[PDB]
């Protein structure tokens, strides 16, 4: 059992509009694919239900979860949820500046207009309260209240446009102090008019049933690799069809980086919501989080809609990953995890951990040649062994019997354990590389000692020390049994 | 990418008494083999004979580092693959097992005989431990 939130208590904690999360079960059970969403700014919910347009990829301005601009995306990203971290806010802006300029026409900005109806909404979530009556130069305003210690706001009794200034004494993240000016919000151009943007839905992942990827593969193209007379490359052709119509994700230009079963998916999800009366276009609109390698993000809660229409909500990353491990990647569904997990994401220097089965089983498997070169590569801060490794993994053993395989391999395996000793006993060159060959040893050791765990525990202080050619392999012929 | 370049260099220090990096067409593959892709003597005579073909076919950096730019391009896999692996490996053992391959096949639509599965594992198997480790799945998927 896992400490997860089920039912309404989860949808409610997902931020997803309820009427939509409902339309989503439909597609989740219908396509037998789990649909996992990342969070969603809650103050953004009713705004979405209301019909507020959602930001695409040409808008990277984080929306606000506080103040009167809460829900929308303040052009001055120091009014958004990042309010405080300078380098963050600084990037927020640039990103918005790039939106307005790099997209003149499609993207712009309008003034914030909170209506008698949104004030209330904000009032209940206890975001901002309508205060006194202020009068400045012939126009009346009402100081909009907020638990904030840097800005002050108001609304016009005329057009309902909100304004804000830095409080006396206090200074902005950037070093700015200004006076009554309008809170501008990112807009989107729709039919000549400028409409305001808001949080979209962010898929954290999409996992279909393997049985589902089939329908994606042409019932032709399949029969070929299937009915292949062979039984070797026949697997390759099966795997490679899995790879093509199952994975190798590509740039859309607008949708981000997703597959084709994901692009089709996206549309199904948006058709779904549109049918519930949502006038504002797409709600889900760029590919899933597993392809977001540059700036990956770890959230503590992931809303999940399983192929049963049920609502789960992992409470922590340790959980979100334990769920997927048990219910998705181990139950016959197709799932992949962000290439930049377990690594240092480049864009944001992020370090997200995830269990990669290929690594668990590493201390018992000896590296291929290339793997050995790469290992020689990204450690070049400041020979001939690569062979005995392209020997161990000689794809041309496919004619041998396990008995033989396990032998020549146990040999080829000790073969390398040699060259990887003729060095640790040579000149001390660099303590950085020495801390590697040690690994190899322990590895090269462990694998051999695992094969022989069929037939050794010290049989090395006898076998061929230092001669060469083909006679060595002869001595081995008996050292074995 | 960058790493899909920085690596290569390491090869240029394995076995060539040329000193200033200079092998030949009689030991070019000796590097590619030990590296990644594995073409035949037929796919090595016309690729090389194009970019640098003077008298003794000078082989260095701006060359090889360029040849892969088309062979190691469409097959920019390795990643597109290492994930295929994780799919068959629903156990998490790190290695693909007979069963592991059945379960995946019986779902892609092809009901595999309890015989074949055990034959696809053996052939695909290299070190002969009875199951395929990632490295083997790589090999089995390119060479
Ligand atoms: N192909 C992609 N798939 C999913 N997320 C992506 C992709 N490319 C980028 N992302 C992003 O991760 C961010 C999440 O916030 P945004 O949706 O506003 O902006 C997004 C991008 O910076
Ligand atoms: Ca094996
Ligand atoms: Yb978004
Ligand atoms: Yb997104
Ligand atoms: Yb998004």
Residue in the block written with tokens 């599965």: B117
CA distance A237 to B131: 19
Q: Which two tokens stand for residue A275?
A: 């049918």
Q: Smallest Cβ distance to B33: which of A214, A390, A451?
A: A390
| Residues in A touching B9 (Cβ below 8 Å) | 377
Equal CATH topology for B1-74 and B75-142: yes
Distance from CA of A412 to the nearest CA of B (A): 10
- Do residue A74 and residue A185 come from a single domain? yes
Q: Are A181 and A109 in contact (CB under 8 A)?
A: no
Ligand 1 shell residues, CB under 6 Å: A 60, 202, 256-257, 286-289, 291-292, 295
Domain range for A311 is 1-40+200-335
Contact B140 A235 (CB under 8 A): yes
Q: Which CATH class is domain B1-74?
A: mainly alpha
Could you identify the residue written with the tokens 């209506």?
Answer: A115
Radius of gyration of chain A (CA): 30
Identify whether the C-beta of residue A272 lies closer than 8 Å to the C-beta of residue A266: no
Instruction: Work out how many CB contacts closer than 8 A connect A with B.
Output: 178
Cβ contacts of residue B47 below 8 Å, gap of 6+?
B39, B67, B71
Domain harbouring A54, CATH code? 3.90.1760.10
Residue A131 lies in a domain: yes
User: Touching check for B125 and chain A: CB below 8 Å?
Assistant: yes
Domain assignment of residue A145, yes or no = yes
Candidate CATH numbers 2.30.40.10, 1.10.238.10, 3.40.50.300, 3.90.79.10; the one for domain B75-142 = 1.10.238.10
3-class DSSP string for A282-293: CCECCCCHHHCC
A80 and A67 share one domain: yes
Domain stop point among A170, A199, A228 = A199
Task: Tell me: do A466 and A477 sit in the same domain.
Answer: yes
The answer to whether A198 and A61 are in contact (CB under 8 A) is: no
Within-domain flag for A344: no
End position of a domain, from candidates A285, A301, A335: A335
Residue B43 neighbours by CB under 8 Å, 6+ apart: none
Tell whether A347 is covered by a domain.
no
Q: What is the rounded (10 degree) CA torsion for B100, B101, B107, B112? A: -130
CA–CA separation, A297 vs A348, rounded Å? 9
Rg (CA), chain B: 19
A433 and A284, same structural domain? no
The answer on A430 and A402 residing in a single domain is yes
- Which residues have a C–N gap over 2.5 Å right after them in chain A? 382, 455
Residues contacting A178, CB < 8 A, separation 6+: A165, A166, A172
CA-based nearest residue in chain B for residue A393 = B126
Of the candidates A160, A79, A209, the residue with the CA atom closest to the CA atom of residue B103: A209
Which of B97, B129, B132 to probe by mutation at the A interface, max A CB count within 10 Å? B129
Selected residues 203-222 of chain A with any CB under 8 Å from a CB in chain B: 209-211, 213-214, 217, 222
CA of A373: how far to CAs of A215, A370, B35, in Å? 40, 5, 7
CB A129 within 8 A of CB A123: yes
Contact between residue A313 and residue A358 where contact means Cβ atoms under 8 Å apart: no
Q: Is the dihedral of CA A91, A95, A101, A107 positive or negative?
A: negative
- Cross-strand bridge partners of residue A305: A35, A311
Q: Looking up tokens 């002050």, which residue turns up?
A: A152
CA–CA dist A411, A470 (Å, integer): 12
- Please identify which of the residues A60, A83, A116, A454 carries the catalytic annotation: A60
| Any domain includes A285 | yes
DSSP state string for A464-476: --S--SSHHHHHH
SS3 assignment, position A130: strand
Give start and end residues of each alpha helix (H) in B3-133: 3-9, 29-34, 45-51, 64-74, 79-88, 98-108, 116-124
Backbone dihedral angles phi then psi of residue A129, each to the nearest 5 degrees: -120, 140
Residue A397 lies in a domain: yes
The tokens describing A297, both together, are 């993000």
- Cβ neighbours of B105 in A, within 8 Å: 238
Q: How many residues does chain B have?
A: 143
Closest CA to B64 of B14, B20, B12, B17: B12
Contact B88, B95 (CB under 8 A): no
Q: What share of chain B is helix, strand, coil (3-state, %, to 5)?
A: 50, 5, 50
**Of A199, A214, A234, the domain-final residue:** A199
**Count: domains in chain A:** 3
Q: How far apart are CA A40 and CA A303, in angstroms?
A: 10
Is A398 designated active site? no
**Helix %, strand %, coil % for chain A, to 5?**
35, 15, 45
Contacts of B16 (CB under 8 A, 6+ apart): B22, B23, B27
Q: Which long-range contacts (CB under 8 A, 24 or more apart) does A378-387 make?
A: A378/B3, A378/B6, A378/B7, A379/A432, A379/A433, A379/A436, A380/B6, A380/B10, A381/A432, A382/A430, A382/A432, A383/A419, A383/B13, A383/B14, A383/B15, A384/A419, A384/B14, A384/B15, A385/A416, A385/A419, A385/A420, A386/B14, A386/B34, A387/B34
Residues ≥6 apart with Cβ < 8 Å to A449: A456, A457
Distance between CA atoms of residues B121 and B143, nearest Å: 17
Nearest-CA neighbor of A282 among A60, A56, A104, A99? A56
Q: What are the residue ranges spanned by the domains of chain B? A: 1-74, 75-142
Same domain (yes/no): A47, A78? yes
Residues with CB under 5 A from ligand 5 (ion): A 200, 202
Say yes or no: A53 and A108 in one domain: yes
**Broken C–N links (> 2.5 Å) in chain B, after residues:** none
Do the annotations mark residue B74 as ligand-binding? no
CA separation for the pair A113, A118 (Å, rounded)? 9
Residue A228 lies in a domain: yes
The single-letter DSSP state of residue B71 is: H
Distance (Å) from the C-alpha of residue A338 to the closest C-alpha of chain B?
10
Among A36, A44, A54, A57, the mutation site with the greatest number of ligand 1 atoms within 8 A of its Cβ is A57
Task: Count the helices and strands in chain A (H runs, E runs).
Answer: 16, 16
Q: Classify the C-alpha dihedral A115-A117-A122-A58 as positive or negative.
A: negative
For residue A229, what is the enclosing H or E element?
Answer: none
Do A204 and A262 fall within a single domain?
yes
A17 and A157 in a single domain? The answer is: no
Q: Does B113 count as an annotated binding residue?
A: no
Which H helix or E strand runs over B95? strand B95-96
Nearest 5 degrees, angle CA A47-CA A52-CA A53? 140
Same domain (yes/no): A295, A375: no
Contacts with B, A 399-428, CB within 8 Å:
400, 402-406, 409
Q: Does A449 touch chain B (CB under 8 A)?
A: no
- Asked if residues A454 and A405 have their Cβ atoms less than 8 Å apart, the reply is no
Q: How far is CA A188 from CA A103, A110, A196, A271, A279, in A?
A: 10, 9, 6, 21, 14
Judge whether A258 lies within some domain.
Answer: yes
Q: Is there a binding annotation on residue B91?
A: yes
Residues A157 and A171 in one domain: yes
Q: Are A95 and A181 contained in the same domain? A: yes
Is B82–A384 a contact, with Cβ atoms under 8 angstroms apart?
A: no
Closest CA to B139 of A253, A361, A371: A371
Q: What is the 3-state secondary structure (H, E, C) of A63-118?
A: CCCCCCCCCECECCCCCCCCCCCHHHHHHHHHHHHHHHHHCECCEEEEECECCHHH
């Amino acid at each position: 059992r896992i400490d997860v939130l089920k039912g309404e208590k989860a949808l409610k904690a997902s931020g997803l509009v309820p009427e939509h999360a409902d339309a989503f079960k439909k597609i989740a059970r219908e396509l037998n694919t789990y649909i996992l969403f990342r969070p969603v700014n809650k103050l953004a919910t009713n705004l979405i239900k209301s019909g507020v347009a959602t930001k695409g990829l040409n808008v990277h301005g984080k929306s606000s979860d506080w103040g009167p601009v809460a829900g929308y995306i303040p052009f001055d990203q120091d009014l958004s949820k990042k309010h405080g971290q300078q380098l963050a806010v600084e990037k927020g802006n640039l990103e918005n500046k790039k939106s307005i300029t790099e997209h003149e026409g499609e993207i712009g900005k309008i003034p914030l207009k909170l209506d008698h109806l949104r004030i209330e909404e904000l009032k209940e979530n206890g975001i901002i309260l309508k205060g006194k009556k202020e009068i400045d130069n012939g126009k009346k305003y009402y100081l909009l209240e907020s638990n904030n210690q840097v800005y002050e706001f108001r609304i016009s009794d005329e057009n309902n446009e909100v304004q804000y200034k830095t409080k006396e004494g206090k200074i902005t993240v950037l070093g700015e102090k200004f006076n009554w000016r309008n809170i501008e919000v990112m807009a989107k151009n729709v039919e000549g008019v400028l409409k305001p943007l808001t949080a979209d839905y962010d898929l954290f992942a999409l996992a279909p049933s393997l049985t589902e990827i089939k329908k994606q593969i042409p019932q032709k193209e399949w029969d070929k690799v299937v009915n292949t007379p062979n039984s070797l490359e026949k697997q390759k052709g099966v795997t490679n069809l899995l790879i093509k119509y199952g994975i190798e994700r590509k740039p859309d230009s607008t949708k981000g980086t997703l597959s084709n079963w994901q692009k089709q998916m996206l549309d199904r999800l948006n058709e779904a919501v549109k049918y519930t009366g949502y006038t504002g276009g797409d709600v889900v609109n760029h590919g899933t989080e597993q392809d977001n390698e540059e700036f990956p993000e770890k959230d503590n809660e992931i809303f999940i809609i399983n192929p049963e229409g049920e609502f789960i909500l992992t409470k922590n990353w340790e959980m979100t990953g334990r769920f997927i491990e048990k219910n998705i990647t181990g139950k016959d569904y197709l799932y992949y995890f962000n290439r930049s997990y377990n690594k240092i994401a480049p864009g944001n220097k992020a370090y997200i951990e995830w269990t990669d089965p290929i690594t668990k089983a590493k201390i018992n498997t000896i590296p291929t040649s290339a793997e050995f070169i790469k290992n020689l590569s990204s450690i070049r801060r400041s020979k001939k062994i690569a062979g005995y490794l392209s020997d161990y993994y000689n794809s041309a053993n496919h004619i041998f019997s396990q008995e033989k395989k396990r032998k020549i391999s146990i040999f080829r395996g000790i073969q390398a354990y040699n060259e990887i000793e003729n060095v640790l006993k040579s000149k001390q060159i660099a303590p950085e590389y020495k801390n590697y060959f040690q690994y190899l040893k322990e590895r090269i050791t462990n694998q051999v000692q695992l094969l022989l765990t069929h037939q050794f525990k010290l049989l090395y202080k006898q076998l061929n020390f230092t001669e060469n050619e083909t006679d060595n392999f002869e001595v081995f012929q008996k050292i074995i049994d | 990418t960058e790493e899909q370049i920085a690596e290569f260099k390491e090869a240029f220090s394995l076995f060539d008494k040329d000193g200033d990096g200079t092998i030949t067409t009689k030991e070019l593959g000796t590097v590619m083999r030990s590296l990644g892709q594995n073409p035949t003597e037929a796919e090595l005579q016309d690729m090389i004979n194009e970019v640098d073909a003077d008298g003794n076919g000078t082989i260095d950096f701006p060359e090889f580092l360029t040849m892969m730019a088309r062979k190691m391009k469409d097959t920019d896999s390795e990643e597109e693959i290492r994930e295929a692996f994780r799919v068959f490996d629903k156990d998490g053992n790190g290695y693909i097992s007979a069963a592991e391959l059945r379960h995946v096949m019986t779902n892609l639509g092809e009901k595999l005989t309890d015989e074949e599965v055990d034959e696809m594992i053996r052939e695909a198997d290299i070190d002969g431990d009875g199951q395929v480790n990632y490295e083997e799945f790589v090999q089995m998927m390119t060479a």
